[PDB]
C-alpha cells in the first residue's frame, strides 16, 4: 500500500539506474543513522539507491527496505558479507538496457516470494503440529509422522459413485506417466510393495529425482524380470504374483507401519486378461486391506465392455500419460495403519463404472504435455486432510499460513482474528496495492494491530516478522537469507511468542519508515510527539507493529537510561534505526473518536491497560 524496497545496486551498475523513472537515492559514506531514516522515509514507491554502506548491519539494511542487486555475488557490510539477492549476468549490464535490467529485477523478485514463505513455513515445522490451508508445498517439507496437514485443496478429476466431470483446466508437461505416478503416491508410506515393478528404471529415476522420500521408504519390488539392485532400502523379489501370500512372507506384523501397495502388472486376441490382472491386483489389496493404508492399482479401460465393475475408492487420470493411453489409475484407501487420517476418502469398495464416462476422462485430461497441475491436485487431495482452518478446533498447536485472507473467507474476519489469537504463527494480507498474481484481501492494519497484540501473541508485518526470527532464532532464519522486504510487508504475521526481557526496542519492532510523510498526508487529507506518533502509526494503516511490546518497551523501558539502556541492548543482540502514560490514552481516545463502529473494542481493551497499567 505504501511500503517500498530500496533497490540497492552496486557501483559498476549505477549509471543505468539514472535513466529510470523511479527515484534514485544516493549515498555517500556519512550519512548518520537518523539520516537514513529521514531520507528513506521520503520515498513513496520503490527506489534505486547506491553508494557506500559498509558501516551498517544487515538487519539494519533489511529493516530499511533493501534489496541487493549487483553483477557481483555479494557485498561487504558491518554485520557480515551478504549473498546478493539479485545477480545480473554481466552480459546483461553491459549492454545497458534500463528495461531488460528492470524486468530482470522483477522476475528474481517474484522468485523471492518463496524465500519469505519458506522462512516462516520453516519456523512453523520447528514449532507446530497442526497445519491449515495447506498445499503440495507444505506436504513437501512435512515429516508426516509429526505434522498433521490440513486444508481444502482444489479437487482433481475423479471417478466414483459419482460424476460431475470435468470441467477442463489448463495444464503443463511433467515427469513421465510412471514416474509422476510414484511422485504423487509417495508421501507417508513407509514400506512399498510395488508389484509388477518392471526393470526398475522407473523407481530409479524417481530416486534420481526425489532422493529423500525414496530413502525414507522400504521397497519390496515384485517381478520375475526385475534386475538385481544393491540399494539397501530396496528389496528385490524375483517371484511372480498370483496370491496375496507372496506378500505376507515379506511383512513385519510385530511392528506398525503405513504400508503402500502398487499394482502395475501386465502380461504378453482379446485382453479380458488385462482385465483380471487389474481385478486381481484389487482382489489382492482388498484381502490385505488391513495391512495397507492404501493401494495404487493399474486400471486399463476396456473396449469390448460398456459398463463394468471393480473395488475402488477413486478413479483418476494420470499425468504425463500419452493421450491415446486409456489407462486410469485406481486408488484404494484402506483400513490398516497410517500417519495421514484418510478416512474422509471413502473406504475402497465395489464401483460400477461406465467406460464412456471414463473415456471422456482420458480424452479431457491425458496428454504427454499435460500433467503438472493434475499431479499436484492428486498429490494434495490424497495426502492432506480435508479440514477448514476457521471452523477447526485444535487440541494441539497450530500454524495458519497464507490462507486466512483468501477471498473465500470474506466476511469471516472475526473467526480470522480468533485464529490469530491462538496460532503459533499465521498471516494475513494487509497490502493495499492493486495487486496481481495474488488473490487475497486486506485487513485494515490499524484493526490488525489492535485485535492482534496479546500477552502471548506478537503481531508484526512480514518484514519485522522476518527480522525478529533472525534476531531471536538465528538458525531458523539465517541472516544472509534472501527475500523482498516490501513483499514481506504486505503481510501481517502473528506468533505465539513472549515479549523480550528487556523489551528492548529492536528493528523487528521499530522501523516506522516514512512516518513523516505519512503524518503530513494525514493532516492535509483527513486532519484534526509520542502521542502524535502512535496516533499516526494507526490512523495511517501504513504500519503493523506489536503494540503491547511497543508499550512495555516505551514505559517500562525508555527512559530508563542513557547508560542502563544500552547496556540492555548489547546484550540482547538488538539493533535500531532511531536514536507519559497519558498522551497515549489521548492517542487512543482520539483515534476511536474518529471511528466508533469501524472498530475497535479495544481501544477499550488497550486504554483499560494504560489506566490500569
Ligand atoms: C477407443 N479406444 C482406443 N484405445 C487405445 O487402445 C489402443 C489399442 O491397443 P491396446 O492394447 O488396447 O492399448 P491399451 O493397453 O491402452 O488398452 C489404441 O486404439 C488406443 O487409442 C483404447 N484403449 C482402451 N483401453 N479402451 C478404449 O476404449 C480404447
Ligand atoms: N511469501 C509467500 N511465500 C509463499 N510460499 C508459497 N506460497 C507463498 C506466498 O503466497 N507468499
Ligand atoms: N507428486 C508431487 N507433486 C508435486 N507438485 C508439486 N510438488 C510436488 C511433489 O513433491 N510431489
Curated annotation (Swiss-Prot):
Pfam families: Orbi_VP4. The keyword Heme does not apply. Gene3D superfamilies: Orbivirus VP4 core protein, C-terminal domain, Vaccinia Virus protein VP39. Its main location: virion. Keywords: Capsid protein, Outer capsid protein, Virion. GO terms for cellular component: viral outer capsid. It is found in: Virion. The VP4 protein is one of the five proteins (with VP1, VP3, VP6 and VP7) which form the inner capsid of the virus. Belongs to the orbivirus VP4 family. This is Core protein VP4. The gene is Segment-4.
Amino acid at each position: 500500500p505504501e511500503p517500498h524496497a530500496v533497490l540497492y545496486v552496486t557501483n559498476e551498475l549505477s549509471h543505468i539506474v539514472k535513466d529510470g523513472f523511479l527515484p534514485i537515492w544516493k549515498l555517500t559514506g556519512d550519512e548518520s543513522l537518523n539520516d537514513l531514516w529521514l531520507e528513506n522515509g521520503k520515498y513513496a514507491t520503490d527506489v534505486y539507491a547506491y553508494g557506500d554502506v559498509s558501516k551498517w548491519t544487515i538487519r539494519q539494511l533489511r529493516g530499511h527496505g533493501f534489496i541487493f542487486i549487483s553483477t557481483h555475488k555479494n557485498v561487504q557490510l558491518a554485520d557480515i558479507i551478504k549473498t546478493v539477492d539479485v545477480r545480473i549476468p554481466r552480459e546483461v549490464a553491459r549492454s545497458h538496457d534500463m528495461k531488460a535490467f528492470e524486468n530482470e529485477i522483477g522476475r528474481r523478485r517474484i522468485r523471492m516470494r518463496k524465500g519469505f514463505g519458506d522462512a516462516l513455513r520453516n519456523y512453523a515445522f520447528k514449532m507446530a503440529i497442526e497445519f491449515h490451508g495447506s498445499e503440495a508445498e507444505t506436504l513437501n517439507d512435512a515429516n508426516p509422522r509429526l505434522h498433521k496437514i490440513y486444508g481444502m485443496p482444489e479437487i482433481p478429476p475423479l471417478y466414483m459413485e459419482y460424476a460431475e466431470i470435468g470441467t477442463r483446466f489448463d495444464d503443463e508437461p511433467t515427469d513421465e506417466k510412471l514416474v509422476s505416478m510414484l511422485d504423487y503416491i509417495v508421501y507417508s508410506a513407509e514400506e512399498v510393495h510395488y508389484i509388477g515393478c518392471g526393470d526398475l528404471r522407473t523407481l530409479m529415476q524417481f530416486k534420481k529425482r526425489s532422493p529423500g522420500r525414496f530413502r525414507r521408504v522400504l521397497w519390496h519390488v515384485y517381478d520375475p524380470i526385475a534386475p538385481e539392485c544393491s540399494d539397501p532400502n530396496v528389496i528385490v523379489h524375483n517371484i511372480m504374483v498370483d496370491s496375496k501370500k507372496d506378500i505376507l512372507k515379506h511383512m513385519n506384523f510385530l511392528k506398525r507401519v503405513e504400508r503402500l501397495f502398487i499394482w502395475d502388472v501386465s502380461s504378453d486376441e482379446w485382453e479380458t486378461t488385462r482385465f483380471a490382472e487389474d481385478r486381481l491386483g484389487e482382489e489382492i489389496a482388498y484381502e490385505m486391506g488391513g495391512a495397507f493404508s492404501s493401494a495404487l492399482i493399474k486400471h486399463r479401460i476396456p473396449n469390448s465392455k460398456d459398463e463394468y465393475h471393480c473395488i475402488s475408492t477413486y478413479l483418476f487420470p494420470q499425468p504425463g500419460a500419452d493421450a491415446d493411453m486409456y489407462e486410469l489409475r485406481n486408488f484404494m484407501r484402506l483400513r490398516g495403519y497410517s500417519h495421514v487420517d484418510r478416512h474422509m476418502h471413502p473406504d475402497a469398495s465395489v464401483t460400477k463404472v461406465v467406460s464412456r464416462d471414463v473415456r471422456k476422462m482420458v480424452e479431457l485430461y491425458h496428454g504427454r504435455d499435460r500433467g503438472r497441475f493434475l499431479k499436484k491436485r492428486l498429490f494434495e487431495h490424497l495426502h492432506i486432510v480435508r479440514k477448514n482452518g476457521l471452523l477447526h478446533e485444535s487440541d494441539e498447536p497450530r500454524a495458519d499460513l497464507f490462507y486466512l485472507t483468501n477471498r473465500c473467507n470474506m466476511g469471516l474476519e472475526p473467526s480470522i482474528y480468533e485464529v490469530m489469537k491462538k496460532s503459533v504463527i499465521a498471516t494475513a494480507w494487509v497490502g493495499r496495492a492493486p495487486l496481481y498474481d495474488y488473490d487475497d484481501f486486506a485487513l485494515p492494519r490499524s484493526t490488525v494491530m489492535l485485535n492482534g497484540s496479546y500477552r502471548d501473541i506478537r503481531i508484526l508485518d512480514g518484514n519485522g516478522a522476518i527480522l525478529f526470527l533472525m534476531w531471536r532464532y538465528p538458525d531458523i532464519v539465517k541472516k544472509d537469507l534472501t527475500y523482498d522486504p516490501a513483499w514481506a510487508m504486505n503481510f501481517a504475521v502473528s506468533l505465539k511468542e513472549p515479549i523480550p526481557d528487556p523489551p528492548v526496542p529492536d528493528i523487528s519492532l521499530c522501523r516506522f519508515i516514512g512516518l513523516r510523510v505519512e503524518s503530513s498526508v494525514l493532516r492535509v487529507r483527513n486532519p484534526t510527539d509520542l502521542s502524535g506518533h502512535l496516533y499516526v502509526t494507526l490512523m495511517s494503516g501504513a504500519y503493523v507493529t506489536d503494540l503491547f511490546w511497543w508499550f512495555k518497551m516505551i514505559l517500562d523501558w525508555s527512559a530508563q537510561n542513557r547508560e542502563q539502556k544500552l547496556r540492555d541492548l548489547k546484550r540482547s543482540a538488538a539493533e535500531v534505526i532511531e536514536w507519559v502514560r497519558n498522551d497515549l490514552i489521548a492517542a487512543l481516545r482520539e483515534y476511536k473518536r474518529k471511528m466508533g463502529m469501524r472498530e475497535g473494542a479495544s481501544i477499550d481493551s488497550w486504554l483499560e491497560l494504560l489506566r490500569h497499567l
